[PDB]
A paper describes a structure:
The KATP channel is a hetero-octamer complex composed of four pore-forming Kir6 (kir6.1 or Kir6.2) subunits and four regulatory sulfonylureas receptor subunits ([name] or SUR2). KATP channels can sense intracellular ATP/ADP ratio using the inhibitory ATP binding site on Kir6 and the activating Mg–ADP binding site on SUR, coupling the metabolism status of the cell to its membrane potential. In pancreatic β-cells, KATP channels are mainly formed by Kir6.2 and [name], and play key roles in controlling insulin secretion. Small-molecule drugs that inhibit the pancreatic KATP channel are widely used to boost insulin secretion for the treatment of diabetes and are therefore named insulin secretagogues (ISs).
Therefore, we used a truncated construct (SUR1core) that encompasses 208-1582 of [name], including TMD1, NBD1, TMD2, and NBD2, for subsequent structure determination. Purified SUR1core protein was supplemented with ATP and MTG for cryo-EM sample preparation and data collection. Image processing yielded a reconstruction with an overall resolution of 3.27 Å. In the presence of ATP and MTG, SUR1core shows an inward-facing conformation with its central vestibule widely open to the cytosol. ATP binds to the NBD1 and MTG binds inside a pocket in the central vestibule of [name]. The MTG-binding pocket is formed by residues on TM7 and TM8 of TMD1 and TM16 and TM17 of TMD2. The central negatively charged carboxyl group of MTG makes electrostatic interactions with positively charged R1246 on TM16 and R1300 on TM17. The benzene ring of MTG stacks with the phenyl group of F433. The bulky hexahydro-2-isoindoline group binds in a hydrophobic pocket surrounded by L1241 and T1242 of TMD2 and I381, I385, F433, and W430 of TMD1. In agreement with this, the hexahydro-2-isoindoline group of MTG is near the S1238, and the replacement of S1238 with a tyrosine would generate sterical clashes with MTG, abolishing its binding.
Author numbering: 218 to 276, 283 to 329, 350 to 406, 413 to 616, 678 to 739, 768 to 921, 997 to 1039, 1060 to 1326, ...
Write the structure that this text describes.
Amino acid sequence: LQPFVNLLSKGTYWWMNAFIKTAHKKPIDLRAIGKLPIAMRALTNYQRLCVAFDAQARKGARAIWRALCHAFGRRLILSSTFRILADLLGFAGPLCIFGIVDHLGKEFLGNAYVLAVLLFLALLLQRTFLQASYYVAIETGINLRGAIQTKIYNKIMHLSTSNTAGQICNLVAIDTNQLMWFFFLCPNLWAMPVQIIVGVILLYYILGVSALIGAAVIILLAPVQYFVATKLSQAQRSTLEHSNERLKQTNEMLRGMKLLKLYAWESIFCSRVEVTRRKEMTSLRAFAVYTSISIFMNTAIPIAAVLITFVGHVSFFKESDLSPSVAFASLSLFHILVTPLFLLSSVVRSTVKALVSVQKLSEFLSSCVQIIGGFFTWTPDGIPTLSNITIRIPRGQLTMIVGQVGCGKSSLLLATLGEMQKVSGAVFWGPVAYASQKPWLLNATVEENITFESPFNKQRYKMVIEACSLQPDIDILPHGDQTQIGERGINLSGGQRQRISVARALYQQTNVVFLDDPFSALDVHLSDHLMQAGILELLRDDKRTVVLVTHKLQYLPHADWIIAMKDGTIQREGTLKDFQRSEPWRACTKYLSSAGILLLSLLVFSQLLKHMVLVAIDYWLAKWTDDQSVYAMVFTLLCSLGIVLCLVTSVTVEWTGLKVAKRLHRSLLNRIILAPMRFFETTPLGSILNRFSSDCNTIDQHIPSTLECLSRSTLLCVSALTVISYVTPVFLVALLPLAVVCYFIQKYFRVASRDLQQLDDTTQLPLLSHFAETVEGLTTIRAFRYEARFQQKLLEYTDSNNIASLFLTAANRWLEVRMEYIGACVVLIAAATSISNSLHRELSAGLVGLGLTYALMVSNYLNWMVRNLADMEIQLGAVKRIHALLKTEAESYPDQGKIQIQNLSVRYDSSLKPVLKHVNALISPGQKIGICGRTGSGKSSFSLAFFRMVDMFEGRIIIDGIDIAKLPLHTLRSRLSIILQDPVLFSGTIRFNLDPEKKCSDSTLWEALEIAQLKLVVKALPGGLDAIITEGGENFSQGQRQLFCLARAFVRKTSIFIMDEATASIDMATENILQKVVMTAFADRTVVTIAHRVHTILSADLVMVLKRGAILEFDKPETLLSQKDSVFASFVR
Ligand SMILES: Nc1ncnc2c1ncn2[C@@H]1O[C@H](COP(=O)(O)OP(=O)(O)OP(=O)(O)O)[C@@H](O)[C@H]1O
Ligand SMILES: O=C(O)[C@H](CC(=O)N1C[C@H]2CCCC[C@H]2C1)Cc1ccccc1
């Protein structure tokens, strides 16, 4: 609430003080953050931008710039006016140091004390204009993002469906941010020229022509600073290529982990991910080189400029003798030109990226029922897709739209709606509940999807779910209801999704309903259930106009009207009779522990030795000004020794950063591979994967750079407070109060800012997610006429994004205003005490300048120390949670088919109910054993029990004379065939997905593919036995993929085969093909089949029934059918 408060509280952000103190105690919630001010709302900014657009266009890429300039120009020069005004008041430090030091070494301005309060007042007054300049630029930048995101969205509700779903979200998340961040750094575009030009002009007057030569070096090194920034960002992209390639290879490893650990291919796929990692680490060296140079230039160009400015002034020109006032006033000017001169690279880089974004943004912004005649074409001009489409469906009566495949069926429905440009014809036609041919699901609850922003009724909902008969399906789902169906509907199944969209159509209370192929993936049994109960007994009962378009003609007789489509034309439209007649410092220690004692010693000793040179340089200047070639000799040497150490301390932090980033990931990968199968099922995949994506990214690129920023600022602030204390020892008395105050300000910030950074991120996701939802189901939204209702949901989402981001900026300004006040209070104590000592005691004029030139800079170092420490705390969440995951568990480490089980006391998990108990069996070599039982009756345990994956087997299994327990895991899994229920084939060649051990012969591998009756399609692939297959994908069918897994099984030749519900998720013909292959090809080798199919184990040598723990296991299935009273298997079959 900055506008309401007065000028003083607004400048000092006193209104934020109570919020900070309150948030320190309890976490920030949406209730804690208030509603947005009227002036800064998404709707208000959007209306202002629309007014600007109307004004500009009333008389392209130029227009949007004019509208952005017109709407947000008044609150932008007001930001630039402060920035310029703060720049001029900035030179009241360097100029007043000139005044103070000169008077000591030699009209109220003639007094040294008077200038000590002018230095105090100007520094106090500058460091609020500068901060109020940052805020108003930010508050305009954030208010702009609110206006554009609404502007982008209001275009989405219009664009034709002929066209890029992911581009629009990218346009919101990246292209708008680059435009927003241009308005953060917009005033600098007019303030760098003013601040630098006055700066360089001042240096000439203070020091002479020699100040230009030193000033030219810094300016001339801005392009080289910029060039490194270009080479770095190129290197980051090339690293981003391998990281995305790595995450694909890792994701396939975690998802299909059970298949891998069954075949003992965990090491092979772990080896393949490391090969991609090493390439990423190679491309990450160049990112370290061009980050090392970037740190080297930013701390060795200021030193180089000082070296050439002073040495050149005394050696070449032989001008006026160097004096403490001139040398230290000029030195303090360099410290305040480098910050503008080194950010100018990022300002130009941002401006060239903002020019692209606007052009990219302006490219996006430019993109019953009776019909008379009618010609509709998806293209703006071309062959009309619908021709002679003249229809008149009745009101309140069901109508069927039936025709050939791909012949104007779904287009005609969209022709009735407004998504088809009319070449000609006349159409006259409220909101319509349209069940899309391709169903779309909101990223929300199953209850939310069906109600779809409509009031809930208990009776209505009960009938709908019973009619669609999707409730029994949700019963098997992991959650009873309110399941979070994310993007793409991965949680739900294809057939289940189709019902939901039809359920959404059937739930709504509207007169006209267009159900576009409700039975596309609906089973024939349920399809009649949905049609009879829902379409007829529910939809037709309510006197609701229903239009249905499906291939199943069985429901044609139960239809008032029916139309026939031919070649995209409505040939005839009549009734059935008419138609028939016509036709954490603990984590930081863990991070620095892995670097190595050698590097860690070199890292620490280089930092401490560098800042004993960067002070011994400045102290030597204070001794110099008071033989004159001798002083230049030592000062040149120290400047070179300062530069050399700036190179060493820039390589080491990056060299260390790679050494940890390499070891931490590699040590992480080898740990989860050895985790037992129980760990992967219990822990959600999202938890493990995000460690490899974000945390291994934060350590790769963010920690090493931040660790340098925090270590460089902390030592500078220690050096600044030591030099300023050696000059005036009385300053130590005031150091304790300013240490206690500076601690609490740091504490309340880190507590409050950490909350808002998390709150900022968690409100970003709903905003982007809403853009994806709108574009994916744009046709459905405009069918319900929920465009206005959906657009309103954006304003709430983006307002909760701005206010969460408008406190993160008011928190930073709160901190920087406090520290700059503390720093402006240190400069008074430093000035007051040194001048007291210099005039009365025997202090020198040079040491006075040395104290002041650090007092001015102790405000910045205090600010970087607390801001970097805030970021270093957050970025150490990467190491903290990796080290937690890194301590997971670790598993310990066939000639004849005789397998024996000793009581099989196997427990599905630690300290749980035993799945199977007291199960004794003995299968002779070369015998086909079958296992059948109820779902969850322990049959599924015996499948994984033979592979020691059940980690609590309190019994014994003897296979071919040995024990499956004593033998090591990677030597027992590798010699036992398995066929999981759901087939999976991982990315790689066919030769590298059927024998990754690279031991199979080329001729043999072809026979195995042919043995599975698969050689024809395999040979048909390009290359042959080397075609680059994709994970799942379309290169193979579901029957073929399950068929290929049989070929992979035949490759092992382990003489013991275990099949676990291979029949499921397969075709009936393929099951006969698979069963015939197993019966014929695998005649020997003791095939064991655990499945629910009746006919799978009918011909087996022996069949074992499974009760809660064990049931009758008749060796002869023929005897079992008679003995079981035709109940156990005969009745089930
Ligand atoms: N973005 C698009 N650009 C061009 N044509 C399009 C586009 N979207 C759809 N179409 C047209 O719509 C046709 C499919 O709809 P149509 O009603 O003609 O067939 P259908 O019988 O409903 O098909 P299906 O069984 O695939 O649902 C395509 O063949 C194409 O001519
Ligand atoms: O001190 C800072 O360096 C500023 C940090 C800050 O205030 N914010 C708030 C913004 C919210 C939206 C996204 C994050 C930014 C970061 C950034 C900045 C603003 C203006 C000028 C220079 C730097």
